[PDB]
Amino acid sequence: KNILKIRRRKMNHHKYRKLVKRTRFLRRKVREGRLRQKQVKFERDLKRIWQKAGLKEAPAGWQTPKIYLKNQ
Amino acid sequence: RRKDLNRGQIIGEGRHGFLWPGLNIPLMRNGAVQTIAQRSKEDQEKVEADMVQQREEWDRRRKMKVKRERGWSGNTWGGVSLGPPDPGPNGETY
RNA sequence: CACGGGAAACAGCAGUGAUAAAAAUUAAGCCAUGAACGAAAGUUUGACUAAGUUAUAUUAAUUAGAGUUGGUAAAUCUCGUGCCAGCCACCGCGGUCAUACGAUUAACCCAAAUUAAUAGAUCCACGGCGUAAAGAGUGUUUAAGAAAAAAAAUCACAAUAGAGUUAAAUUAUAACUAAGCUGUAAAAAGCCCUAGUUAAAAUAAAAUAACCCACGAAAGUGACUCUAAUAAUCCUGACACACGAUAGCUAGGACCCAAACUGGGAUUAGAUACCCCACUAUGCCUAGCCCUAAACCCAAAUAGUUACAUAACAAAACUAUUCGCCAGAGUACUACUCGCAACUGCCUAAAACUCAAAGGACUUGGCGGUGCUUCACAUCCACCUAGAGGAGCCUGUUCUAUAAUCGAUAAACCCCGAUAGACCUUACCAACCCUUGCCAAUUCAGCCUAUAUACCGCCAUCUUCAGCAAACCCUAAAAAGGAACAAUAGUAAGCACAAUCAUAGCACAUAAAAACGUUAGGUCAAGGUGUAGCUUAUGGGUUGGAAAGAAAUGGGCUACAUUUUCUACAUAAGAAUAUCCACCACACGAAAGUUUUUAUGAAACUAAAAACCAAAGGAGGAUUUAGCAGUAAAUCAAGAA
Ligand SMILES: [Mg+2]
Ligand SMILES: [Mg+2]
Ligand SMILES: [Mg+2]
Ligand SMILES: [Mg+2]
Ligand SMILES: [Mg+2]
Ligand SMILES: [Mg+2]
Ligand SMILES: [Mg+2]
Ligand SMILES: [Mg+2]
Ligand SMILES: [Mg+2]
Ligand SMILES: [Mg+2]
Ligand SMILES: [Mg+2]
Ligand SMILES: [Mg+2]
Ligand SMILES: [Mg+2]
Ligand SMILES: [Mg+2]
Ligand SMILES: [Mg+2]
Ligand SMILES: [Mg+2]
Ligand SMILES: [Mg+2]
Ligand SMILES: [Mg+2]
Ligand SMILES: [Mg+2]
Ligand SMILES: [Mg+2]
Ligand SMILES: [Mg+2]
Ligand SMILES: [Mg+2]
Ligand SMILES: [Mg+2]
Ligand SMILES: [Mg+2]
Ligand SMILES: [Mg+2]
Ligand SMILES: [Mg+2]
Ligand SMILES: [Mg+2]
Ligand SMILES: [Mg+2]
Ligand SMILES: [Mg+2]
Ligand SMILES: [Mg+2]
Ligand SMILES: [Mg+2]
Ligand SMILES: [Mg+2]
Ligand SMILES: [Mg+2]
Ligand SMILES: [Mg+2]
Ligand SMILES: [Mg+2]
Ligand SMILES: [Mg+2]
Ligand SMILES: [Mg+2]
Ligand SMILES: [Mg+2]
Ligand SMILES: [Mg+2]
Ligand SMILES: [Mg+2]
Ligand SMILES: [Mg+2]
Ligand SMILES: [Mg+2]
Ligand SMILES: [Mg+2]
Ligand SMILES: [Mg+2]
Ligand SMILES: [Mg+2]
Ligand SMILES: [Mg+2]
Ligand SMILES: [Mg+2]
Ligand SMILES: [Mg+2]
Ligand SMILES: [Mg+2]
Ligand SMILES: [Mg+2]
Ligand SMILES: [Mg+2]
Ligand SMILES: [Mg+2]
Ligand SMILES: [Mg+2]
Ligand SMILES: [Mg+2]
Ligand SMILES: [Mg+2]
Ligand SMILES: [Mg+2]
Ligand SMILES: [Mg+2]
Ligand SMILES: [Mg+2]
Ligand SMILES: [Mg+2]
Ligand SMILES: [Mg+2]
Ligand SMILES: [Mg+2]
Ligand SMILES: [Mg+2]
Ligand SMILES: [Mg+2]
Ligand SMILES: [Mg+2]
Ligand SMILES: [Mg+2]
Ligand SMILES: [Mg+2]
Ligand SMILES: [Mg+2]
Ligand SMILES: [Mg+2]
Ligand SMILES: [Mg+2]
Ligand SMILES: [Mg+2]
Ligand SMILES: [Mg+2]
Ligand SMILES: [Mg+2]
Ligand SMILES: [Mg+2]
Ligand SMILES: [Mg+2]
Ligand SMILES: [Mg+2]
Ligand SMILES: [Mg+2]
Ligand SMILES: [Mg+2]
Ligand SMILES: [Mg+2]
Ligand SMILES: [Mg+2]
Ligand SMILES: [Mg+2]
Ligand SMILES: [Mg+2]
Ligand SMILES: [Mg+2]
Ligand SMILES: [Mg+2]
Ligand SMILES: [Mg+2]
Ligand SMILES: [Mg+2]
Ligand SMILES: [Mg+2]
Ligand SMILES: [Mg+2]
Ligand SMILES: [Mg+2]
Ligand SMILES: [Mg+2]
Ligand SMILES: [Mg+2]
Ligand SMILES: [Mg+2]
Ligand SMILES: [Mg+2]
Ligand SMILES: [Mg+2]
Ligand SMILES: [Mg+2]
């Protein structure tokens, strides 16, 4: 009966958790790896604007904070 | 399928071709009490040919037995005529 | 976009390299039309006109071929092959008798085409969302919409948030008292700074009432008291806003008891588990996060109706207004994205690939270390008797050995086909020989050669079990079911059981009987056969030769002795009696061997009898067989071949 659907899920979940334990630190890399792409693409997004709006420098008092890498 | 060997053979019928007064031949002719007689070689070749053609006839008659009217498709019995229902107990007939 | 730059342009007509599953003439004319110029005749026009090439499509006839033939779906015979070679669009076909393969033979249907492939046209949902894919964990509002009348009454009292309080129990820690106390199916470990009693704060958790069904939007909420307090003159509404069980995370407190983890102890093949014992994160408070549930009543909100109406099952069927959600199954509470006080997280959520299914509900079976009742009568347990497993021997399997049968081989084989092998039987091996080679006739005989999963015969087995089965009849449909006796849809001849027969009168007992099916149970070696094979041989004869034991085991026989052994004898007798001791060995036990006879027989290898010899055995491990009365046990005699 419908348990037979749940069994599949139950297994697929278990078999996933196990995986994410072994793979943990590999995972941890690739997460942060993409956060450093994010923050960069983000930056370029704004850089694009100065250069598109004709300004040479980034406007006064702009440090362009890091949102994605926010921790603690 | 079952073939019968009771078909085609008369009494006294034989390959050595004897005509027995009570079986192969009626008991009497214009003259009474025919004796025990033997046919020719060729008369026998003919009667044997007759039995052979009999068997051939029966085999053809067994093979010709495939004919049908189709109901919907082929081996689907849908729409096949079953034939008028059975007369009831009261003599009622359809 | 073309100033400028690459660079030197057929996406005009013909043609050509390269590329691609993709192939028209380097063709003639301005004669018609159209165009450009001309005042005009007219000139030019690879536009166009007429051809040329091509089954690309229709038409006409002169042209006959392709595909199919298990089913959907028109249409098949014989071979070959034997899960191989191969085929199919879907279901599928091939494992020795293939209408599915390859090839014939007939047919079918299309037809100058026919099939295959790939793209289309066509194809979801104005259908759904309890169990099938789908009502979000909860509320309010925005945007957007929908609108006759009635539509705020009260807790039968346990929303929430504060602040204060404690009855039962438990624990520290003392006073006594006894050595144990704890703990399981049974124990062990564990603790004796233990246990019972008498005292007693904190912390934690809230018997009964509750057979109540209230309060909150949901989560949730039921010890006591007081404070604050439960939105909207009440329609729907989000990705916005505010909440959201447990567990978890951060910091600080708390710690009676519980308890993942872990360490002991058992259990177990193992036991990282279930059982036992400790002890920890953690449940508790204050503050901050996390935002998940079988967050399920799997049933959206608000007004209605009980009309119409039974897929199934479950909580009976539906309008109207809305929003939310669902387009096969996996893959996938997944990969990538987006956002989040999360950084083994949450949310949103695909495709490649694979399959022809995946699902829901039901129906009879069978099964169940589910529950309940009732039994077992040689029968499971408890019980009684006598044996098997140990010893010798007999005899059957199984293995080794042999040139040298076959068959049976869980219950349902194993002193089995055999109520029976020295030659014969005989099917076996070894050599030799014979080819219409039993018969009335036959390009015919003969085959203990392969199929017991082609079979008839005879049987085993459930089984001393009560059911099987035609003919009907009923069920808001039927896969199937079909009884209640103060009776509710069943009737029915048949075959089973029962009844009668037999065991020389009864009775009981035994014998017999015991269907339908089940086990593709047994047997092509009783005989007979379907299909296949053999034919100067898988046929038929003569002569010899087989059946040895390292063992392992099934069943028997005889013992192991005093309820015995011997002789007499029929059932009151006399003697012997395992230790003396040097017996001049004897007590039981020789069925075994060595010798001699005799029975049979052409042939002793076979049976019996005497003489000798006297061995293992001193009542048998786990485990097992049988018997409910004239039975078990013991004793004796006969027959079949
Ligand atoms: Mg899986
Ligand atoms: Mg990534
Ligand atoms: Mg057909
Ligand atoms: Mg250009
Ligand atoms: Mg230029
Ligand atoms: Mg070009
Ligand atoms: Mg061209
Ligand atoms: Mg050009
Ligand atoms: Mg080319
Ligand atoms: Mg073409
Ligand atoms: Mg020209
Ligand atoms: Mg043309
Ligand atoms: Mg044509
Ligand atoms: Mg031709
Ligand atoms: Mg093979
Ligand atoms: Mg064949
Ligand atoms: Mg076909
Ligand atoms: Mg074929
Ligand atoms: Mg054509
Ligand atoms: Mg439609
Ligand atoms: Mg429904
Ligand atoms: Mg569902
Ligand atoms: Mg889906
Ligand atoms: Mg709901
Ligand atoms: Mg909501
Ligand atoms: Mg959820
Ligand atoms: Mg408005
Ligand atoms: Mg209204
Ligand atoms: Mg508080
Ligand atoms: Mg107290
Ligand atoms: Mg106390
Ligand atoms: Mg105490
Ligand atoms: Mg106990
Ligand atoms: Mg102890
Ligand atoms: Mg209660
Ligand atoms: Mg309640
Ligand atoms: Mg209110
Ligand atoms: Mg609302
Ligand atoms: Mg929470
Ligand atoms: Mg918590
Ligand atoms: Mg603690
Ligand atoms: Mg304390
Ligand atoms: Mg504890
Ligand atoms: Mg342990
Ligand atoms: Mg075990
Ligand atoms: Mg257990
Ligand atoms: Mg403790
Ligand atoms: Mg709590
Ligand atoms: Mg709940
Ligand atoms: Mg529930
Ligand atoms: Mg749901
Ligand atoms: Mg709603
Ligand atoms: Mg409301
Ligand atoms: Mg109505
Ligand atoms: Mg039904
Ligand atoms: Mg899908
Ligand atoms: Mg989850
Ligand atoms: Mg995820
Ligand atoms: Mg989002
Ligand atoms: Mg017994
Ligand atoms: Mg029994
Ligand atoms: Mg014994
Ligand atoms: Mg023995
Ligand atoms: Mg044998
Ligand atoms: Mg051998
Ligand atoms: Mg055998
Ligand atoms: Mg056999
Ligand atoms: Mg058997
Ligand atoms: Mg026996
Ligand atoms: Mg012999
Ligand atoms: Mg032979
Ligand atoms: Mg075989
Ligand atoms: Mg059989
Ligand atoms: Mg049979
Ligand atoms: Mg009956
Ligand atoms: Mg019936
Ligand atoms: Mg009688
Ligand atoms: Mg009787
Ligand atoms: Mg009997
Ligand atoms: Mg009877
Ligand atoms: Mg068999
Ligand atoms: Mg068997
Ligand atoms: Mg035979
Ligand atoms: Mg035959
Ligand atoms: Mg021979
Ligand atoms: Mg011989
Ligand atoms: Mg033995
Ligand atoms: Mg005995
Ligand atoms: Mg005496
Ligand atoms: Mg002897
Ligand atoms: Mg002796
Ligand atoms: Mg001894
Ligand atoms: Mg036993
Ligand atoms: Mg005799």
Q: What is the SS3 assignment for A63?
A: coil
Q: How far is the CA of A25 from the centre of ligand 31 (A)?
A: 54
Question: Resolution of this entry in Å?
Answer: 3.6
Q: Per 3-state DSSP, what percentage of chain B is helix, strand, and coil (rounded to 5)?
A: 25, 5, 70
- Contact between the CB of A14 and strand C at under 7 Å: no
How far apart are the CA of B94 and the centre of ligand 8, in A? Answer: 89
Q: Which of A5, A12, A67 minimizes the C-alpha distance to A40?
A: A67
Distance B56 CA to ligand 62 centre (A): 77
Q: How is chain A split into domains, by residue range?
A: 1-72
Give, in Å, how far the C1' of C346 lies from the CA of B89: 79
Instruction: From the CA of A13 to the C1' of C426: give the distance in Å.
Output: 74
3-state secondary structure at position B37? strand
Asked if A17 CB < 7 A from strand C, the reply is yes
Technique used to solve these coordinates: cryo-EM
Nearest to A62 by CA among A47, A51, A72, A41: A47
Q: How far is the CA of B32 from the C1' of C114 (A)?
A: 77
- ∠ CA B54-B56-B61 to the nearest 5 degrees? 95
Residues 6+ apart with CB under 8 A from B79: B71, B72
Which nucleotides of strand C lie under 7 Å from a protein CB? 70-75, 131-133, 294, 298, 330-334, 336-340, 343-345, 359-361
How remote is the C-alpha of B87 from its chain's centroid?
Answer: 33
CA neighbours within 13 Å on the CB side: how many for A36? 6
Half-sphere exposure (CA, 13 Å, Cβ side) for B36?
3
Q: Is the CB of A28 under 7 A from strand C?
A: yes
Q: What residue ranges in chain A does DSSP mark as E strands? A: none
Cα separation, A49 vs A33, in Å, equals 25
What's the DSSP call for residue A15?
A: H
CB B52 within 8 A of CB B34: no
